[PDB]
DNA sequence: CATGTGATCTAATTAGATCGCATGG
DNA sequence: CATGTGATCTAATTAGATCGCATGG
């Protein structure tokens, strides 16, 4: 994933799952306020999508992955929102000679479990990152990179039971449009 | 949809067998006459793994638990030219009343599958043969026969064992074999009646029986729960080497590890039906070696 | 003593089994190639019964209770060419400390077959050939040898199957066989010793084990009960189809009426080492017919 | 078993094992006086006899078998008595043509139970008669054809334990006289 | 001084019955 | 209206270890 020059930094196009970031991701500048053809696709149900309704929501460059923030607002496990994040991901991923930089991330607002965690790791192919709080896996190399302040759970167990992730939004900019 | 290979292009099949009981796969394959170069087994049955190693004199190559097995395995045990499972159903099967769904419980092992399918899949522009399957109960939520239909990317072939077994077992077949839905046809050597099944000196009362689970219940046929089998005009429920005879594995196939009744019958109740599994590996035998 | 018979003047031989067990006798004589005409048994185990029917087809007669056989039967089921038996042992071996000896409990089994013999016997005046066996433990009460050799008019002869087997098992035979004295010696398919008889991926850490028993302790070696047998770098006991092939017995021969280990190993610990009847009954295919 | 005129019958020629019993073949008859070589051979302990010793002790015409009456010194089991009189007794009896008569017979003084009385009727063939007491098998005709007074045995079951043979028994060699010397 | 055609008592362990209901027949 | 790639709890039934000693080695 080598840097971009400013002058070719096309706009971003991110698939939201779960949750949606748009104004999130408006503050930060990635995307025209002026929405006219959307540059966002938002599903909260993937349940009945296929790999050809992805294929023609245009090719990605984002792909977003989220839990329920323990909002008990949850018809459904919590496994299933990991399950169906992985089963889009391979559906959005461009061919293998790569044209552009495709990034995806995968964050957890502490509702999975140990068992689940270390399923989702798996998946993912990563363990996952803590940003002070929530759980995030990506291909991002400065959410990878950046040492984020490092303290363990074992006190945010009984402890714990946006701006923070928002930060790691940001490293996208050295490799798309800059809107202010 | 995949071409015809010559005789002579022809070689050894490469399988990797998530979830793999006894071996059904590797019998099926070794009865079919296909040379089985690599045959990658995912079980932690200890039983299980006694019947596939000593049935098979350690052609197999056992690999444990299958969550502990990662990208890097399957390329170097790759490539492979066959993937086949079926994940457990104890909590996908109506059966249990108190299943946990395909997310829950034992049914995420099936994205195991799902997730090791996609490591073994040829990269593109790799026009070279590859076939899958995957078994399950019918008797699942349609929630899960849905989501499991979603992450496979195809939909499933129900075949019943009572067309060439002596019992009943609907199951669902996703997968890309050649000729899936063609009809099933029955064997010259196939035990149809569960007469065919018993021993000297037994005789049946019906000629198929329940579908047959790890319990012991499923032997007694009907609401009544009667039992199968008369010999000496006395009342039996079937023996081990009968049960192995309806699910048309080889006789004292699970004769091993000193296992009793209790414990051969939890091996076959959630195997394969092997006529079954015939008819559909049959024609991989036009793409791999003879033998 | 008796006089060679004609090859074409043979006629199929009709054998009386009493304590017949798991037809070791009739197995026996159909390996050796002797055509059996009829083979009257006298047992009352079920479980015994069954592999007996199973494993021959129902060529054996089975006539329940040796101490329910009356002389009308003996000449309604004869004549009889041989007159086989095994009485139990519970009451006569050594392992026993509260064995009843020889006139009480079980011992006193052993005159049925004394009593049933008498009345198979030829009539005076009958040079027809005639022949008979009984076998009963080494490790019996001088007494007990002294009266059973008095009652049959006969002294033992000691055949181990250590010398054709894998395992200890000294064993007392009385008859009028032909060569029962005689040497004897391995044949070219005896798996003399204990890693002939396990199955694949298993390793034996011994070459010969101790007598085999009814009892599962009689598995563990040595006065420090040692597991006769490693497996994946683990101590384990033998297997049932282990078992069979150590006593000559053919694999999966008590895989009969849902045994379990405990079962298979009670009718094996009672059985005879088949190598050492071969030995004793090979003679008799100069005076029976053939096939 | 005709009967034989009395010109020509001549004396027995009696085995007695476990139990010796010239006291009473004599007092009735069957064994004479001066006696110098013996027609009643008399063995104790049998376990060490051969069915040559039986036919050296030249052909026999009664083979009588007793067990030891209500005695607690016995270092046999009771079924040995029976298992040892039912071996010797096939030693005894001649080729099969039966030129002259053959009798045998074997009494127990209540001490054969029941488990070991089936075993006795079986071996020797026939059910017992009871004597008013001990139980009497035997081929000798009149002992099973004349009928003695019927006993109901569960009032004899208690009194086999009062005792805590010479004269019931008499009237059993009584018709053995039919067919055998009368000496007086 | 290690051995045994078994019986025993107790601890594991297994057998068998009951439970369970969406769903085509 | 009958069916089922099972889990449960409790009831029979094993599995396992200890017992036992005359005797050749
Ligand atoms: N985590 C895991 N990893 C690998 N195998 C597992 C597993 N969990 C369960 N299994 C095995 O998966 C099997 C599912 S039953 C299916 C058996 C097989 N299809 C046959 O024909 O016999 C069981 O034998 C079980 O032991
Ligand atoms: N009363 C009886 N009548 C007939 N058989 C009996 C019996 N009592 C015991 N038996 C049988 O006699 C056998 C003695 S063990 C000998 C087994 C046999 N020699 C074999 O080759 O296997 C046992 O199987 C037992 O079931
Ligand atoms: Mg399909
Ligand atoms: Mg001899």
Redesign the interface.
Same mark, same amino acid.
């Given at each position: 994933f080598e840097t971009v020059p400013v002058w070719r930094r096309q706009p971003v196009r991110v698939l939201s799952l779960f949750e949606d970031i748009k104004k999130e991701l408006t503050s930060l500048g990635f995307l025209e306020s002026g929405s006219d053809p959307g540059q966002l696709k938002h599903v909260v149900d993937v349940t009945d999508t296929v790999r050809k309704d992805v294929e023609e929501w245009g090719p990605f460059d984002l792909v977003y992955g989220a839990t329920p923030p323990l909002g008990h607002t949850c018809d459904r496990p919590p496994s299933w929102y990991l399950f169906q994040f992985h089963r889009l991901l391979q559906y959005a991923r461009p061919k293998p000679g790569s044209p552009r930089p495709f990034f995806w991330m995968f964050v957890d607002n502490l509702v999975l479990n140990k068992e689940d965690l270390d399923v989702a790791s798996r998946f993912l192919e990563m363990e996952p990152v803590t940003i002070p709080a929530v759980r995030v896996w990506s291909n991002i190399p400065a959410i990878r990179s950046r040492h984020w302040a490092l303290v363990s759970e074992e006190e945010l167990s009984l402890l714990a039971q946006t701006k923070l992730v928002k930060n790691c939004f940001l490293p996208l900019r050295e490799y798309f449009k800059y809107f202010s | 949809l995949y071409p015809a290979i010559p005789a002579a292009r022809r070689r050894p099949i490469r399988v990797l067998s998530l979830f793999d009981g006894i071996a059904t796969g590797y019998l099926v394959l070794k009865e079919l006459g296909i040379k089985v170069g690599k045959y990658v087994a995912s079980e932690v049955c200890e039983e299980s793994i006694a019947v596939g190693?000593?049935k098979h =004199? +350690?052609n197999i190559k056992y690999v444990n638990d299958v969550?502990n097995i990662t990208?890097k395995n399957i390329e170097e045990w790759g490539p492979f030219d066959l993937v086949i499972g079926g994940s457990p159903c104890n909590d996908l099967s109506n059966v249990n009343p108190a299943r946990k769904?395909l997310?829950?419980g034992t049914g995420?092992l099936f994205?195991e599958f799902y997730?090791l399918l996609?490591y073994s899949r040829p990269? =593109? +522009?790799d026009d070279r043969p590859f076939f899958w399957m995957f078994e399950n109960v019918v008797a699942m939520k349609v929630g899960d026969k849905?989501?499991i239909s979603?992450?496979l990317?195809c939909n499933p072939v129900m075949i019943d064992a009572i067309k060439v077994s002596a019992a009943h077992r609907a199951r669902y077949f996703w997968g890309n074999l050649p000729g899936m839905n063609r009809p099933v046809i029955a064997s010259k050597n196939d035990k149809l009646e569960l007469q065919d099944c018993l021993?000297?000196?037994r005789i049946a009362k019906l000629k198929k029986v329940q579908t047959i689970t790890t319990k012991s219940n499923s032997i007694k046929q009907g609401k009544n729960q009667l039992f199968p089998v008369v010999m000496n005009g006395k009342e039996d429920?079937l023996?081990?080497?009968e049960l192995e005879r309806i699910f048309g594995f080889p006789?004292?196939y699970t004769?091993?590890?000193?296992?009793?009744?209790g414990a051969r019958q939890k091996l076959l109740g959630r195997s394969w039906s092997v006529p079954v599994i015939r008819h559909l590996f049959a024609p991989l035998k036009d793409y791999f070696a003879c033998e």
């Open positions: - | 190693t000593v =004199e +350690g969550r990208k769904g997310y829950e995420r994205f997730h996609n990269k =593109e +522009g849905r989501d979603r992450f990317e021993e000297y000196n429920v023996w081990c080497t006789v004292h004769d091993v590890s000193n296992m009793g009744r």
